[PDB]
Amino acid sequence: KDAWEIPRESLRLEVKLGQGCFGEVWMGTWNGTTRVAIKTLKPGTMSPEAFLQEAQVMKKLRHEKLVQLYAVVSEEPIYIVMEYMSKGCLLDFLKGEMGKYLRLPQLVDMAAQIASGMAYVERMNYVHRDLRAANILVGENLVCKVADFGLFPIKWTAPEAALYGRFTIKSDVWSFGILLTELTTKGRVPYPGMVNREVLDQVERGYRMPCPPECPESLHDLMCQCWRKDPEERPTFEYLQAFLEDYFTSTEPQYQPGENL
Numbered sequence: 247k248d249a250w251e252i253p254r255e256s257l258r259l260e261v262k263l264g265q266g267c268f269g270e271v272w273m274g275t276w277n278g279t280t281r282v283a284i285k286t287l288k289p290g291t292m293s294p295e296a297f298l299q300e301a302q303v304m305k306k307l308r309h310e311k312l313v314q315l316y317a318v319v320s321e322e323p324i325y326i327v328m329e330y331m332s333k334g335c336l337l338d339f340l341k342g343e344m345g346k347y348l349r350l351p352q353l354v355d356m357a358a359q360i361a362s363g364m365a366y367v368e369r370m371n372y373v374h375r376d377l378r379a380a381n382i383l384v385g386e387n388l389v390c391k392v393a394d395f396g397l398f399p400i401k402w403t404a405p406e407a408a409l410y411g412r413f414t415i416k417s418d419v420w421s422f423g424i425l426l427t428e429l430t431t432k433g434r435v436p437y438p439g440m441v442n443r444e445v446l447d448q449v450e451r452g453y454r455m456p457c458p459p460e461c462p463e464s465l466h467d468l469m470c471q472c473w474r475k476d477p478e479e480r481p482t483f484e485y486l487q488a489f490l491e492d493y494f495t496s497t498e499p500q501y502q503p504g505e506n507l
C-alpha cells in the first residue's frame with residue numbers, strides 16, 4: 247500500500263536468530279545482494295495493525311544511529327525488513343569474546359553514538375522507554391544503533407517511571423546512566439546482588455551505583471547526573487552527546503589505559 251512495500255519473493259531467508267512469542271527474526275538476503283534482518287509475525291498470534299505499528303514508527307524515526315527500516319511485506323505472512331548489524335546485540339558483544347579487548351576509548355565512543363541516536367529521539371520529542379545495552383545493535387567498525395526488540399526492567403527504569411508511569415526523554419536519560427555501567431563492566435547486570443524490590447527501595451532512599459573499578463570519576467559523575475531524583479535536573483542527550491564526544495580532550499586529557507578500561 248505504500249512505497250516501502252516489496253514482494254515476498256525478493257527475500258531469501260537464511261539463518262534463524264531466535265523466536266519471541268509473536269514470531270521469528272532471520273538473517274538473510276534482499277534482492278540477492280543485501281544483508282538484511284527480517285522480523286516475522288506468526289499469523290493469528292496478533293493483528294497486522296499492531297505488528298506493523300513498529301514499521302510505522304521506524305518510518306518516522308530515521309537516523310544514522312537508529313536502526314534502519316528497509317521494507318515491508320504487509321500481507322500475511324507479514325515481514326519487516328531492516329539493515330543487518332553484523333555483530334548483534336551490544337549486550338552479547340560486551341560479555342562475549344569481544345569484551346576482553348574493549349577499552350574506555352572505544353566504550354565512550356559507543357556511548358557517544360548511542361547518545362547521538364538518543365539526541366535525535368529527544369529532538370523528535372519521542373520517548374524510548376527501554377534504553378539499555380540489550381537494545382543496542384553493533385555494526386561494522388564499532389558502529390552502534392538504538393533499536394527496540396520488544397523485550398519489568400526496573401533495574402534500568404527511573405523511579406518516576408517504574409512507580410507512576412511517567413516515562414519521558416528524562417527517564418530515557420536515567421536509563422542512559424545505567425547503560426554507562428553496562429559499558430564499563432562489560433555488560434554485567436546493574437546493582438549486582440540486589441533483587442528488584444530492593445532496587446526500588448534502595449534507589450528511593452538515594453542509593454546509587456559506585457564508581458565501577460577503573461572507571462574514571464568524571465564518568466561516574468555523569469552517570470550520577472543521569473540519576474538525579476528530579477527528572478528536570480538530568481541533562482539532555484545533546485549535552486551527553488557532546489560531553490562524550492569531547493571526553494578525551496576536555497574531561498580526561500591524562501587518561502592512560504589499565505587492565506580492563
Ligand SMILES: Cc1cccc(-n2nc(C(C)(C)C)cc2NC(=O)Nc2ccc(Nc3ncnc4ccc(N)cc34)cc2)c1
Nearest residue numbers: 263283299300303307313329330331334392393394395396
Ligand atoms: C516492538 C516495537 C514497537 C514499536 C516500535 C519499535 N521500535 N522502536 C524503535 C526506535 C524507537 C528505537 C526507533 C525501534 C523499534 N523497532 C526495532 O528496533 N525493531 C527491531 C530491530 C532489529 C531487530 N533485529 C535485528 N536487526 C538487525 N540486526 C540484527 C542482528 C542480530 C540480531 N539478533 C537481531 C537483529 C528486530 C526488531 C519496536
